[PDB]
Structure formats: C-alpha cells, structure tokens
C-alpha cells in the first residue's frame, strides 16, 4: 500500500520482525539475527552479485556476525551472573570487566 | 593463552580451542575472527582461512547431518546466515 | 540452600574430612535436595520440570 500510494519505502525487516514480537522466542532471536545481518551500509549498485562479492561488504557481514555473537555471549554472561549473584559477587560497578 | 593468540594473530586454524569454546557460536566466533579476505602472500596457507573456505566448510565439509538439522534447525540457519550464505539458509528454512 | 549458595561448594569440602572411604550419598542427597528447594523458587515451568 505504501509503494502504491507513493510513500517513503518502510523497513520491511521491522514489519516482518513485529510478527516475531508474539510467541516463539527462537523465531524472535532468528529475526534479531537477520536484522543484525541486514544492518549493512550497502554500495547502492544495480547488481547484487557485485555487492555480495565486494571485499568491503564481506568484511561488513563478518563484522556484524561477530557483533551478534559477542552480544549473544554478553546476554549469556549477564543472565548467568544475575541468576547466580551470591556466587558472582557483582557488587556495584557497571562494565564488561 | 592459546585462544587469545590464535584470534589476535589469525593462526592455528586447525585448532578449535575446545577447552575454552563451549558451543557452536564459539566455533563460529573463533573462526570468524580468524578470517582474512586479502591475498597477503606472506601468510602461510596452513594459517589462512578465507570466508569462502569457511562457507564451504559448513555447507559441504560438515553438512545438515553434522548440525542435527531435524532437532536444531535454527542452529543450522544461524550457522549459514552468520556466514552470509543467505540463499542456502532460505533454501534450508523453506524445506521444514 | 536458604541463602541460595550451591551445595557442591560445601559437600566436596566435607568429603575430604568426614568418612575417609566413599563419602558420597550424603552429598547426592544434599544435591537432590538443593535442586528440589531451588525448584520451589524457579517460576519458569519447563526449567522447574528440568
């Protein structure tokens, strides 16, 4: 409807991912992962094979995949520490250290 | 002390740091930091992982039976999508 | 258990200093009990069933 009425193109990732703000939490992390892997400052070329073959864009896919896996393990280290605070002895200082 | 060096020096691609990497994410994260894109001919090939070698390694040199796809489908989707094999990840996710 | 410490971090200290043979079932029963009393505080159902 937004294309037909000429409007600004919406982010289709946020339209689809809000269907994963419902029940299945694994589909919710799957859409979070898809979104972090489409967070890419693409070269606006008329060729997908040249953009997917770029050295810069393939560095960006790995830079995002590492950021996703790092925030994933940051969520795991947060949840593990907040469940076990009496062992963990977190105190009162914020930061990953 | 091994794992931190194998990351920072992009070396020992044939070690998996399995005393430190608990899970499939940690294999992905180890090997993804070990990636090069660049033909620096001073790198010996026994230390040289490209993204395209790692893409093939997951899709063809391990495959759908290695990741137990029928029981953990989102983990194999994670393995393909975090290696930017988006078309293979869709042609997997459009089966089940 | 009350103050929500893990009993592995006292059973394995008792086992060097109590019956010097196979001090075992005191620790198994204590851990079975720790898991049962932690199940009284766990609100995620599938993990209480775990």
């Amino acid at each position: 409807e937004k294309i037909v009425n000429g409007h600004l193109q919406p982010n289709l990732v946020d339209l689809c991912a809000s269907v994963a703000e419902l029940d299945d939490k694994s589909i919710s992390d799957m859409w979070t992962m898809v979104k972090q892997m489409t967070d890419v400052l693409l070269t606006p070329a008329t060729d997908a094979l040249k953009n997917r073959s770029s050295v810069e864009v393939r560095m960006e896919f790995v830079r995002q995949a590492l950021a996703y896996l790092e925030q994933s393990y940051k969520n795991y280290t947060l949840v593990t520490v907040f469940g076990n605070l009496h062992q963990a002895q977190l105190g009162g200082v914020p930061g990953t250290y | 002390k091994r794992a931190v060096y194998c990351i920072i020096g992009r070396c020992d691609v044939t070690d998996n740091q399995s005393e430190v990497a608990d899970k499939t994410e940690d294999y992905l994260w180890l090997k993804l930091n070990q990636v090069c894109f660049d033909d620096d001919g001073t790198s010996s090939p026994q230390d040289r992982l490209t993204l395209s070698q790692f893409q093939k390694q997951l899709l063809e040199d391990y495959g759908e039976s290695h990741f137990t796809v029928n029981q953990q489908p989102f983990l194999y989707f994670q393995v393909l999508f975090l290696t930017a094999q988006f078309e293979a990840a869709v042609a997997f996710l459009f089966r089940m | 258990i009350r103050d929500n410490a893990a009993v592995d971090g006292i059973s394995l200290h008792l086992q060097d200093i109590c019956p010097l043979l196979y001090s075992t079932d005191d620790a198994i029963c204590s851990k079975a009990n720790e898991l049962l009393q932690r199940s009284r505080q766990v609100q995620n159902k599938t993990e209480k069933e775990r």
Binding site: - | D22, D26, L58 | -
Partner: peptide
C-alpha cells in the same frame, strides 16, 4: 578431531531471553 560442537549458547541456560512470560 577438528569439527564444530553441536550446541547453542542457550542449551545450558534452558530458559533464556525476554519472552516466555504470560503477561506485562
């Protein structure tokens, strides 16, 4: 010898994330 493990970061967590809650 060289192979991936076959586990996610959430298996030894059993109940993860922000979801699986019946009301806000």
């Amino acid at each position: 010898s060289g192979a991936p493990p076959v586990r996610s970061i959430y298996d030894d967590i059993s109940s993860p994330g922000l979801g699986s809650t019946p009301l806000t």
